[PDB]
């Protein structure tokens, strides 16, 4: 499937997601943003079966936006991840399960801490310093295991992420047409427009 | 399984072997395959033990509830209730049923309900795995208006042969005699019928 | 008071007034009778000719159930039809499961339980008909009459409608004068006379006589309508007796 | 493909003298890929401890379900659930999904607060209870754990001796399973104190 | 299910249950709306019969339906919550399907539709 | 005053619809009696055929529920047959589910539970009938269990129902006060029927012909009703001593 | 699994082995396969262990309610009818194979039932992987008019055949004796001919053998006062 | 048909009032008084059991104060049976929220849901409303210590101090007189008991006629503790405050 | 057909009274007296077997019923309403507890379930309340011995001792004078028989009185031996002879 990486540094979470959308023979698009803002300080990247990915992401987004209005309050990243896990855990024993894997990068404004949650289509949740889905981990985790330090700056996090993407572009057979990078911190969500 | 019902002067006689098999293993060698639904209406069961026992229980219940309201059911009525269950559920059932009963107006009657869930009224019927070996014998030897003794000998000799050749059949030959006098149970042991 | 405003409500007497009011609709209706003969039953009904514009012999009132049961009723004709429609469903399901055509006593209870069910709730209205029915089964001839309450019994003779008192008196004479029994052909003649005698309570308008019969010897135990020569013979016998 | 051996991991529970021990590895994986070295498989509802192996999504779901149920139990009963009762709840809960079951190997451990009797129990994925006096094993290295526990175990071990036995049983069993290891935790449970120890083991 | 027709016409062509619902509104605390050239203001009366009230947590009279639309009311407080909840769900449903937040007119038309439905449905006031 | 129309409590804590259903019970103007022998249970009921047009063979308030259980009804025939059909369905279903014949007292309880529901649920009216269930139970022996529109039931040594139940009850009471036993110490059911008829004659102060009575007899493994000629043989034996 | 039922003069005896196996691995060396439907109606289960246990508790529960409703001690033919109608409805998807035995006011009864909903009746029955080993012993030694002490011995002899000759069976023998007009006596581990021999060595470790990273006290208590 | 016997529980009066809600409130006005007082460092729940007996087992008895979870408790005024139906629903909602979000339900979200259920019985179904008024004492990490009330109408409001049941008019005047914002739990305990003591229809206020509960951060460090007072503990606080 | 009564038949009157519950309590008041007394080592529940006719076999009518092996129930009011409640109480003990936890419910929670069924008949569509008050005596491991009263409203209260029905007011005053926290079971039975004699007019003997206890485990009444942990039911119904023996020491 498509590559979605995540790395939690000192004061922010960084989500990198491929831009390619391939339908069998042809690459239909090379600028696809595989992410949805769930709340001002929570971002979710996704990869899986065509159609199901966006349908699930927008469904979650709608539910978190509904809660935000009802209570006039932003749910903690932990609370949002738990809600998403339950929805995927419910989905696997459904008539037609969502084949969707997600990373949830959020900044908890109460604890003043960045948080990264990795949830697969089964509803398998784990909190990680850095995560991936599909084959992305196989190429990148050896580099992250070596270089990652919990007191890394955002700039150091982006540099380690560039080394991860470079290794993917070298050894992965598929052309994923680069990655859109987004940072989640105390000030909210912004996109790195040059990568 | 070897089972058969025969129409005679006095009424009707039902006969069966007593073997229940699971592959090559004889699970029970003295099983009673002749089950009463009413006082003078009996059924012989072939195919799935689970399916046949389940249906027999329901028919017994239907004839009991019938009797409470409308009095004694005809043998035809009993056969009809079986056919209804077997025909409507033919996709989920493996049951071959002979129904033998005695009215005082209709006297002795025999009905067979094969796999399909069709009904056939016959002077005599044979069913079960062993029946295939005695189609020749039964056709040559059956007469209409036999005595009780003649009919017992005909069934004893018939099931004897079917037990001899069929591995799925064996044990004792149980028989039920339905007449105006009432219900008589007969049993015949290997040492008796093997030397025929 | 207010006990008579709702169906299924017991009055301080222990009565269901709504059922007793349904009987008034029955008593308002035309006369219908039944006669149990040696080997079967005869049914007859009074049909009031409201206008010359009514097509003779077309507005048939007596109904068949299965092929061996006849049904006639007095009161609200639609309620009678609704009951016969149910009777036909009951007779159909019985024969489907048990093969044999429904016995008359068995069929009597099927109507009885259904009519009784319409006295259990305030969400339904009792039947505004008394039904006379019967036929031939394996145990011979049976005649039944079924009131709005769900009450029914077996009868030698039965009558209902506006001229029931007159009819009953005539039926009682036949029972006394014929202990050995009445023949099917005699019963048809007697049925014609009793309807003509019972028409004195409905003497304003002239009427049309309708007869049916089930007999083991005469109809092979099937329900048939008395037509042509046999009907005219019965009308002639009836007209001779009133004069 | 086999749901019970996608994520991997093991749980073992033993009885000692006036004490019980329950232990688990910390690995969560996607078949060959190691994903997490902090995935604890032992939970507790009051003084009753529940270890769950098998499909990780079901491990999390059942923990949330038994927390839910034991919290309602306490509000209504006005007392903490006991190991014997909780065992019957786990069995009931698993079997009501008879034809769509949770792919798990649960293990109950705890001391009855009134009798003071040490209690352990194991279940198959549809809730058949295994109430062994000695030890219960579960997970992708259950064969290895059976082998270790059968030789190492002796009855009436003191809490600090039982720790060594269950620790060596888990470690050496995990080191002969590809889908187990990446750290280990051991709970030593007495009537009114519970100690939790993280073991140092090879990280391959 | 309870199917009783509570909202019905009277001989003079009035639906009393709808008119008696307006009498509940008359009793409710005063709400006012004034739109300027580049703003709208919603003023709301708080009856001072209730002091020792915790104003932090007490349900406020003006509710956000979305980030751009607000709803105030007069009448039964419990009834208002059901209309606010339905409106908030429809606002997020609109964003999900039309990929655009509701217009003020559309949100009004929806809430007004819910209120109408409860004037000719069985077993509801 | 709609607390009198449906089965809800009056200010006195009474159900008037239940009380009025009890009054409907005596609408037929028929008296029934049930007694127990050593080996049998006998039930006798008055038979009144007022119309000469009726077929007297079809006029009956005694029902054969199962092979073992008999039932006599005090109340209108529609409600009687409603209760009869349900009792027959319940007895048949019981045998199918639990693999043994439904006991007399268990059927009595089941019909009583059904009657209780009609006293609590508003949409269902009570049945205006008192059901007397008789059998020779394979565990308890000769058994009389009676149900009423209130949903009440109890076992009886003997019992009477109808307009003149008190006269029959007191008569039976006085006999069992003498004998100091819970049954009629008699071998044959014939003589237990002769006792039942004799004590009804004494209590009502009326003579009976063969067509004025209706008799049901419960023995081990069957309940049956007597023909007019079987009752005549009984009446002859009473007159000859 | 080896399970047998044997009829005798004044009652019925049921026996079973004590081994539960996950394929070739032995999960419980002293399992209890003798389940109670009602005080004097005991049954033993082969097939899916969860199914046999579950199906006996459900029918056992409904039997207790039926007993209270009818004011009568429960009958074996009731348990039988309820088991077969349940199992048949599920078309063998509930893998419960049971030997049902007991005493009631009717007398002493012995039935078997298979997962699909068929039932068997006999004076001696066997069930499970070791049924052929057990049935060999029963067919060799069974006679009419057995005494209670002969029936226990025959039933026990038939289980032993299973224990020794069938790999699916092993360990001890459980027995339950249901005699007419008496309390059913459950004899847990009636025979124990498979006690593990003393090991050559003690594997008790010196204290401090295991490497530890962190210790911490776990709070199993509720939130405290003050 | 059936229409004849329908009371029509969910209709407006000509004045625009809900008959059954107004009559249910009349019922609650005869129930034992319940008081909630919110302080800076905790909440107090005090409630009066209705004319008891000497043979009532008090130590195992509960009619007034119920636990919804570890952070939220309720004081009941009205039909005890009706209350238990709603309490069991609230307990399930609190566990549903904890399962979904892996966080304890905020106090207001629980109060709104129970209040929405009550509302439903006034607008549809044709059933009688719940003859119950609740005082919710709860804590969460957003608003801290919170007091709410809900009544059969399904309307809920927040309070610093509030009463429900009998003599609320007299009770609310006494609370409004003596309550201050900088008040502490130990002071609030005294106010709650002094108010009941003056408003009670009984001759004297004793331990056997009271149910008492406190929600304190008087739990060792950064956590909250619920304390349902035992009969002997109510007797001790009555002597301490100088009422007996 | 269909049950078209989907609306409450119990509603608040202008005075705040639930008429049908009040009237149900009036039906209970007319009912025959039943009482319960809790001792240190057991509980006793008793009532009069008011035989409708002497021909009637009053043994076949059970006013005191076993709900679980350790819980018993007696009533005052409408007998039929009690009988169906006992059938529902026995079933709910299994469906909503035993089939989940593999053990019988504690007294307070079964009482809670019976209370819920009686509350619903007070609010549910097209039904009247139950015209009974129940006295439920039971034992469980963690709560010990307990006695509960359940009213038509669904309200339940725990009692040391109490009486309901005809002569409850007088009976409760009699129990207040005699009850202490040091009573043995035999002492509670003695007080139960003294209290019940006051409210009985005619015959007073073992055949006219129905009395059951929740006391020690009865291994003789278990029906099987072999399992040490299973020691038998704590509920036991006293025989006609056992009552008459204690009426000589009265
Ligand atoms: Cl009949
Ligand atoms: Cl029932
Ligand atoms: Cl097998
Ligand atoms: Mg390893
Ligand atoms: Mg590795
Ligand atoms: Mg009613």
UniProtKB/Swiss-Prot annotation, chain A:
Which residues get modified to Phosphoserine? 76
The Gene Ontology biological process terms listed for this entry are: proteasomal ubiquitin-independent protein catabolic process; proteasome-mediated ubiquitin-dependent protein catabolic process
Q: Which UniProt keywords apply?
A: Acetylation, Cytoplasm, Nucleus, Phosphoprotein, Proteasome
GO MF terms held by the record? endopeptidase activator activity
Q: Which GO terms describe its cellular component?
A: cytosol; endoplasmic reticulum membrane; nucleus; proteasome complex; proteasome core complex, beta-subunit complex
**What family name appears in the similarity comment?**
Belongs to the peptidase T1B family.
Also noted in the record is:
Present with 21800 molecules/cell in log phase SD medium.
Residues modified as N-acetylmethionine are 1
Q: Where in the cell is it found?
A: Cytoplasm; Nucleus
Protein name per the record = Proteasome subunit beta type-4
Assembly and oligomerization: The 26S proteasome consists of a 20S proteasome core and two 19S regulatory subunits. The 20S proteasome core is composed of 28 subunits that are arranged in four stacked rings, resulting in a barrel-shaped structure. The two end rings are each formed by seven alpha subunits, and the two central rings are each formed by seven beta subunits. The catalytic chamber with the active sites is on the inside of the barrel.
Curated annotation (Swiss-Prot), chain B:
Answer yes or no on keyword Protease: yes
Q: Which domain of life is it from?
A: Eukaryota
Annotated GO biological process: proteasomal ubiquitin-independent protein catabolic process; proteasome-mediated ubiquitin-dependent protein catabolic process
Q: What class of enzyme is it?
A: hydrolase
Localization (cell): Cytoplasm; Nucleus
UniProt keyword terms in alphabetical order:
Acetylation, Cytoplasm, Hydrolase, Nucleus, Protease, Proteasome, Threonine protease, Zymogen
Principal location listed in the UniProt entry: cytoplasm
Q: Which GO terms describe its cellular component?
A: cytosol; nucleus; proteasome complex; proteasome core complex, beta-subunit complex; proteasome storage granule
**EC number of this enzyme:** 3.4.25.1
Q: Which reaction does it catalyse?
A: Cleavage of peptide bonds with very broad specificity
Instruction: List GO molecular-function terms, semicolon-separated.
Output: endopeptidase activity; threonine-type endopeptidase activity
Query: What remark does the entry add?
Result: Present with 7250 molecules/cell in log phase SD medium.
The record's function comment reads:
The proteasome degrades poly-ubiquitinated proteins in the cytoplasm and in the nucleus. It is essential for the regulated turnover of proteins and for the removal of misfolded proteins. The proteasome is a multicatalytic proteinase complex that is characterized by its ability to cleave peptides with Arg, Phe, Tyr, Leu, and Glu adjacent to the leaving group at neutral or slightly basic pH. It has an ATP-dependent proteolytic activity. PRE3 and PRE4 are necessary for the peptidyl-glutamyl-peptide-hydrolyzing activity. This subunit is necessary for the peptidylglutamyl-peptide hydrolyzing activity.
Q: Which family does it belong to?
A: Belongs to the peptidase T1B family.
- The name under which this protein is listed is Proteasome subunit beta type-1
Give me the gene this protein comes from.
PRE3
UniProtKB/Swiss-Prot annotation, chain E:
Coiled-coil segments: none
Residue intervals passing through the bilayer: none
- List-wise, which residues carry Phosphothreonine? 58
Query: Where is it located?
Result: Cytoplasm; Nucleus
| UniProt family annotation | Belongs to the peptidase T1A family.
Instruction: State the oligomer form and interacting partners.
Output: The 26S proteasome consists of a 20S proteasome core and two 19S regulatory subunits. The 20S proteasome core is composed of 28 subunits that are arranged in four stacked rings, resulting in a barrel-shaped structure. The two end rings are each formed by seven alpha subunits, and the two central rings are each formed by seven beta subunits. The catalytic chamber with the active sites is on the inside of the barrel. Interacts with CIC1.
Physiological role: The proteasome degrades poly-ubiquitinated proteins in the cytoplasm and in the nucleus. It is essential for the regulated turnover of proteins and for the removal of misfolded proteins. The proteasome is a multicatalytic proteinase complex that is characterized by its ability to cleave peptides with Arg, Phe, Tyr, Leu, and Glu adjacent to the leaving group at neutral or slightly basic pH. It has an ATP-dependent proteolytic activity.
Give the miscellaneous note. Answer: Present with 16800 molecules/cell in log phase SD medium.
- Please identify the protein, giving its name as recorded: Proteasome subunit alpha type-4
Source species of the chain: Saccharomyces cerevisiae (strain ATCC 204508 / S288c) (Baker's yeast)
**Coverage span on the entire protein:** 3 to 127 of 254
Curated annotation (Swiss-Prot), chain I:
Per the entry, what this protein does is: The proteasome degrades poly-ubiquitinated proteins in the cytoplasm and in the nucleus. It is essential for the regulated turnover of proteins and for the removal of misfolded proteins. The proteasome is a multicatalytic proteinase complex that is characterized by its ability to cleave peptides with Arg, Phe, Tyr, Leu, and Glu adjacent to the leaving group at neutral or slightly basic pH. It has an ATP-dependent proteolytic activity.
For this protein, the record's InterPro entries field holds: Ntn_hydrolases_N, Proteasome_alpha, Proteasome_alpha-type, Proteasome_asu_N, Proteasome_sua/b
Q: Name one GO biological process term.
A: proteasome-mediated ubiquitin-dependent protein catabolic process
**Descriptive protein name:** Proteasome subunit alpha type-2
Tell me the SUPFAM superfamilies matching this sequence.
N-terminal nucleophile aminohydrolases (Ntn hydrolases) (SSF56235)
Extra remark beyond the main annotation = Present with 7060 molecules/cell in log phase SD medium.
Location of the Glycyl lysine isopeptide (Lys-Gly) (interchain with G-Cter in ubiquitin) covalent cross-link?
108
**UniProt xrefs under Pfam families:** Proteasome (PF00227), Proteasome_A_N (PF10584)
Family, similarity comment: Belongs to the peptidase T1A family.
Its source organism is Saccharomyces cerevisiae (strain ATCC 204508 / S288c) (Baker's yeast)
Gene3D superfamilies associated with the record? Glutamine Phosphoribosylpyrophosphate, subunit 1, domain 1
Instruction: Pull one GO CC term from this UniProt entry.
Output: proteasome complex
Keywords for this entry?
Cytoplasm, Isopeptide bond, Nucleus, Proteasome, Ubl conjugation
Per the UniProt record, the lineage of the source organism begins with:
Eukaryota, Fungi, Dikarya, Ascomycota, Saccharomycotina
Major subcellular location class: cytoplasm
- Localization: Cytoplasm; Nucleus
């Amino acid at each position: 499937m498509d590559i979605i990486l995540g790395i939690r540094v000192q004061d922010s979470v960084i989500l990198a997601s491929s831009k390619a959308v391939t339908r069998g023979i042809s690459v239909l698009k090379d600028s696809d943003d595989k992410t949805r803002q769930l709340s001002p300080h929570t971002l979710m990247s996704f990869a899986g079966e065509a159609g199901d990915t966006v349908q699930f992401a927008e469904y979650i987004q709608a539910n978190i936006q509904l809660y935000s209005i009802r209570e006039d309050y932003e749910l903690s990243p932990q609370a949002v991840s738990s809600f998403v896990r339950q929805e995927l855990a419910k989905s696997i024993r459904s008539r037609r399960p969502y084949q969707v894997n997600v990373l949830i990068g959020g900044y908890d404004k109460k604890k003043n801490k960045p948080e990264l949650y990795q949830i697969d289509y089964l509803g398998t949740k784990v909190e990680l310093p850095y995560g991936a889905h599909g084959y992305s981990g196989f190429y990148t985790f050896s580099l992250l295991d070596h270089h990652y330090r919990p007191d890394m700056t955002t700039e150091e996090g982006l540099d380690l992420l560039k080394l991860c993407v470079q290794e993917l572009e070298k050894r992965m057979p598929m052309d994923f047409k680069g990655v859109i990078v987004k940072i989640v911190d105390k000030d909210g969500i912004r996109q790195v427009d040059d990568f | 399984t070897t089972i058969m019902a025969v129409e005679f002067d006095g009424g009707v006689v039902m006969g069966s072997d007593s073997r229940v098999s699971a592959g090559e293993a004889v699970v029970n060698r003295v099983f009673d395959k002749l089950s009463p639904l009413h006082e003078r209406i009996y059924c012989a069961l072939s195919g799935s033990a689970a399916d046949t026992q389940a249906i027999a229980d329901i028919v017994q219940y239907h004839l009991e509830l019938y009797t409470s309201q409308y009095g004694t059911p005809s043998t035809e009525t009993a056969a009809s209730v079986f056919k209804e269950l077997c025909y409507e559920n033919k996709d989920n059932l493996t049951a071959g049923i002979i129904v033998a009963g005695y009215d005082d107006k209709n006297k002795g009657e025999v009905y067979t309900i094969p796999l399909g869930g069709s009904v056939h009224k016959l002077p005599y019927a044979i069913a079960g795995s062993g029946s295939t070996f005695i189609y020749g014998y039964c056709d040559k030897n059956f007469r209409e208006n036999m005595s009780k003794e003649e009919t017992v000998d005909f069934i004893k000799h018939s099931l004897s042969q079917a037990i001899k050749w069929d591995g799925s059949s064996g044990g004792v030959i149980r028989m039920v005699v339905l007449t105006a006098a009432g219900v008589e149970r007969l049993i015949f042991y290997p040492d008796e019928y093997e030397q025929l | 008071t207010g006990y008579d405003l709702s169906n299924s409500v017991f009055s301080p007497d222990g009565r269901n007034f709504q059922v007793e009011y349904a009987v008034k609709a029955v008593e308002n209706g035309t006369t219908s009778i039944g006669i149990k003969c040696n080997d079967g039953v005869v049914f007859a009904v009074e049909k009031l000719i409201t206008s010359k514009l009514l097509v003779p012999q077309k507005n048939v009132k007596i109904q068949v159930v299965d092929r061996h049961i006849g049904c006639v009723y007095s009161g609200l004709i639609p309620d009678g039809r609704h009951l016969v429609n149910r009777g036909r469903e009951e007779a159909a399901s019985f024969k489907k499961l048990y093969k044999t055509p429904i016995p008359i006593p068995a069929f009597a209870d099927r109507l009885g339980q259904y009519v009784q069910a319409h006295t259990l709730y305030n969400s339904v209205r009792p039947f505004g008909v008394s039904t006379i029915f019967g036929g031939v089964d394996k145990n011979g001839a049976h005649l039944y009459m079924l009131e709005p309450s769900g009450s029914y019994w077996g009868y030698k003779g039965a009558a209902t409608g506006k001229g029931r008192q007159s009819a009953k008196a005539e039926l009682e004479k036949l029972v006394d004068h014929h202990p050995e029994g009445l023949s099917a052909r005699e019963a048809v003649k007697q049925a014609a006379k009793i309807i003509y005698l019972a028409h004195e309570d409905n003497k304003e308008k002239d009427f049309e006589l309708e007869i049916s019969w089930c007999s083991l010897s005469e109809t092979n135990g099937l329900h048939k309508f008395v037509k042509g020569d046999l009907l005219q013979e019965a009308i002639d016998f009836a007209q001779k007796e009133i004069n | 493909s086999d749901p019970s051996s996608i994520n991997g991991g093991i749980v073992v529970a033993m009885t000692g003298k006036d004490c019980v021990a329950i232990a688990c590895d910390l690995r969560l994986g996607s078949q060959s890929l190691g994903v997490s070295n902090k995935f604890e498989k032992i939970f507790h509802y009051g003084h009753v401890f529940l270890g769950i192996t098998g499909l990780a999504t079901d491990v999390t779901t059942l923990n949330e379900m038994f927390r839910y149920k034991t919290n309602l139990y306490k509000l209504k009963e006005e007392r903490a659930i006991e190991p014997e009762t909780f065992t019957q709840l786990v069995s009931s809960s698993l079997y009501e999904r008879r034809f769509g079951p949770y792919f798990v190997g649960p293990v109950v451990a705890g001391i009855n607060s009134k009798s003071g009797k040490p209690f352990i129990a194991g279940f198959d994925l549809i809730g058949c209870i295994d109430e062994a006096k000695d030890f219960i094993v579960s997970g992708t290295a259950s064969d290895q754990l059976f082998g270790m526990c059968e030789s190492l175990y002796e009855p009436n071990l003191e809490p600090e001796d039982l720790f060594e036995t269950i620790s060596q049983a888990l470690l050496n069993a995990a080191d002969r399973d590809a889908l187990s290891g990446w750290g280990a935790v051991v709970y030593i449970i007495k009537k009114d104190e519970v100690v939790k120890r993280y073991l140092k083991m090879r990280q391959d | 299910g309870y199917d009783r027709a509570l909202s019905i016409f009277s001989p003079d062509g009035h639906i009393f249950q709808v008119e008696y619902a307006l009498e509940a509104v008359k009793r409710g605390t005063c709400a006012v709306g004034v739109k300027g050239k580049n703003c709208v203001v919603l003023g709301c009366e708080r009856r001072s019969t209730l002091k020792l009230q915790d104003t932090r947590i007490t349900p406020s009279k003006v509710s956000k339906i979305d980030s751009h639309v607000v709803l105030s009311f007069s009448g039964l407080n419990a009834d208002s919550r059901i209309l606010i909840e339905k409106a908030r769900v429809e606002a997020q449903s609109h964003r999900l399907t039309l990929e655009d937040p509701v217009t003020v007119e559309y949100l009004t038309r929806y809430v007004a539709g819910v209120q109408q439905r409860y004037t000719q449905s069985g077993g509801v006031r | 005053g709609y607390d009198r129309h449906i089965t809800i409590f009056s200010p006195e804590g009474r159900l008037y619809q239940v009380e009025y259903a009890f009054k409907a019970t005596n609408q037929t103007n028929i008296n029934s009696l049930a007694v127990r022998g050593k080996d049998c249970t006998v039930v006798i009921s008055q038979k009144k055929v007022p119309d000469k047009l009726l077929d007297p063979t079809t006029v009956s308030y005694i029902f054969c529920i199962s092979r073992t259980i008999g039932m006599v009804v005090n109340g209108p025939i529609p409600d009687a047959r409603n209760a009869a059909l349900r009792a027959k369905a319940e007895a048949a279903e019981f045998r199918y589910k639990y693999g043994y014949d439904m006991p007399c007292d268990v059927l009595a309880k089941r019909m009583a539970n059904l009657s209780q529901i009609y006293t609590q649920r508003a949409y269902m009216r009570p049945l205006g009938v008192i059901l007397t269930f008789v059998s020779v139970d394979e565990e308890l022996g000769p058994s009389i269990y009676k149900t009423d529109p209130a949903g009440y039931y109890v076992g009886y040594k003997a019992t009477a129902t109808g307009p003149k139940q008190q006269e029959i009850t007191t008569n039976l009471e006085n006999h069992f006060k003498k004998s100091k036993i819970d049954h009629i110490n008699e071998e044959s059911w014939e003589k237990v029927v002769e006792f039942a008829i004799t004590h009804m004659i004494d209590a009502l102060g009326t003579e009976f012909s063969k067509n004025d009575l209706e008799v049901g007899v419960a023995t081990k493994d069957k309940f049956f009703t007597l023909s007019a000629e079987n009752i005549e043989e009984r009446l002859v034996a009473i007159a000859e001593q | 699994t080896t399970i047998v039922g044997v009829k005798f003069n004044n009652g019925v005896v049921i026996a079973a082995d004590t081994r539960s196996t996950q394929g070739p691995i032995v999960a419980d060396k002293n399992c209890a396969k003798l389940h109670r439907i009602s005080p004097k109606i005991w049954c033993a289960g082969a097939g899916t262990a969860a199914d046999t246990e579950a199906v006996t508790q459900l029918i056992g529960s409904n039997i207790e309610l039926h007993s209270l409703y009818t004011s009568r001690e429960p009958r074996v033919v009731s348990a039988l009818q309820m088991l077969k109608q349940h199992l048949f409805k599920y078309q063998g998807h509930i893998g419960a194979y049971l030997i049902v035995a007991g005493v009631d006011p009717t007398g002493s009864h012995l039935f078997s039932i298979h997962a699909h909903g068929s039932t068997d009746v006999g004076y001696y029955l066997s069930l499970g992987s070791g049924s052929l080993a057990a049935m060999a012993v029963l067919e060799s030694h069974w006679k009419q008019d057995l005494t209670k002490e002969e029936a226990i011995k025959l039933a026990s002899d038939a289980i032993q055949a299973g224990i020794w000759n069938d790999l699916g069976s092993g360990s001890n023998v459980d027995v339950c004796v249901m005699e007419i007009g008496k309390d059913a006596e459950y004899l847990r581990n009636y025979l124990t001919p498979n006690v593990r021999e003393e090991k050559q060595k003690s594997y008790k470790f010196p204290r401090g053998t295991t490497a530890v990273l962190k210790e911490s006290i776990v709070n199993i208590c509720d939130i405290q006062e003050e | 048909g059936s229409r004849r016997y329908d009371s029509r529980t969910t209709i407006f009066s000509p004045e625009g009032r809900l008959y059954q809600v107004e009559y249910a409130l009349e019922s609650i006005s005869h129930a034992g008084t319940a008081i909630g007082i919110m302080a800076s460092d905790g909440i107090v729940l005090a409630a009066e059991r209705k004319v008891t007996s000497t043979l009532l087992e008090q130590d195992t008895s509960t009619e007034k104060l119920y636990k919804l979870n570890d952070k939220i408790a309720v004081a009941v005024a009205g039909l005890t049976a009706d209350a238990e139906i709603l309490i069991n629903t609230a307990r399930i909602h609190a566990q549903n929220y904890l399962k979904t979000y892996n966080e304890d339900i905020p106090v207001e979200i629980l109060v709104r849901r129970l209040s929405d259920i009550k509302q439903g019985y006034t607008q549809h179904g044709g059933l009688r409303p719940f003859g119950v008024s609740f005082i919710y004492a709860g804590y969460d990490d957003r608003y801290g210590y919170q007091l709410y009330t809900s009544n059969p109408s399904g309307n809920y409001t927040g309070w610093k101090a509030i009463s429900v049941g009998a003599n609320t008019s007299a009770a609310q005047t006494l609370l409004q007189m003596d309550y201050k914002d900088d008040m502490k739990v130990d002071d609030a305990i005294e106010l709650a008991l002094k108010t009941l003591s003056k408003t009670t229809d009984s001759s004297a206020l004793t331990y056997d006629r009271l149910e008492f509960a406190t929600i304190r951060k008087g739990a060792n460090d950064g956590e909250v503790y619920q304390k349902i007072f035992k009969p002997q503990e109510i007797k001790d606080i009555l002597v301490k405050t100088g009422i007996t | 057909m269909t049950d078209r009564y989907s609306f409450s038949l119990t509603t608040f009157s202008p005075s705040g009274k639930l008429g049908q519950i009040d009237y149900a309590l009036t039906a209970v008041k007319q009912g025959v007296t039943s009482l319960g007394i809790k001792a240190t080592n057991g509980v006793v529940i008793a009532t009069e077997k008011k035989s409708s006719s002497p021909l009637a076999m009053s043994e076949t009518l059970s006013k005191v019923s076993l709900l679980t092996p350790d819980i018993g129930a007696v009533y005052s009011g409408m007998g039929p309403d009690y009988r169906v409640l006992v059938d529902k109480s026995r079933k709910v003990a299994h469906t909503s507890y035993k089939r989940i936890y593999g053990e019988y419910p504690p007294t307070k929670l079964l009482v809670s379930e019976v209370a819920k069924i009686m509350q619903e008949a007070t609010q549910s569509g097209g039904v009247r309340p139950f015209g009974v008050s129940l006295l439920i005596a039971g034992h469980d491991e963690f709560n010990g011995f307990s006695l509960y009263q359940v009213d038509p409203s669904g309200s339940y209260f725990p009692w040391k001792a109490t009486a309901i029905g005809k002569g409850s007011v007088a009976a409760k005053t009699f129990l207040e004078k005699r009850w202490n926290d040091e009573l043995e079971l035999e002492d509670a039975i003695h007080i139960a028989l003294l209290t019940l004699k006051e409210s009985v007019e005619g015959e007073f003997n073992g055949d006219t009185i129905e009395l059951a206890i929740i006391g020690d485990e009865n291994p003789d009444l278990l029906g099987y031996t072999g399992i040490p942990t299973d020691k038998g039911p704590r509920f036991r119904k006293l025989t006609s002879q056992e009552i008459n023996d204690r009426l000589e020491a009265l």
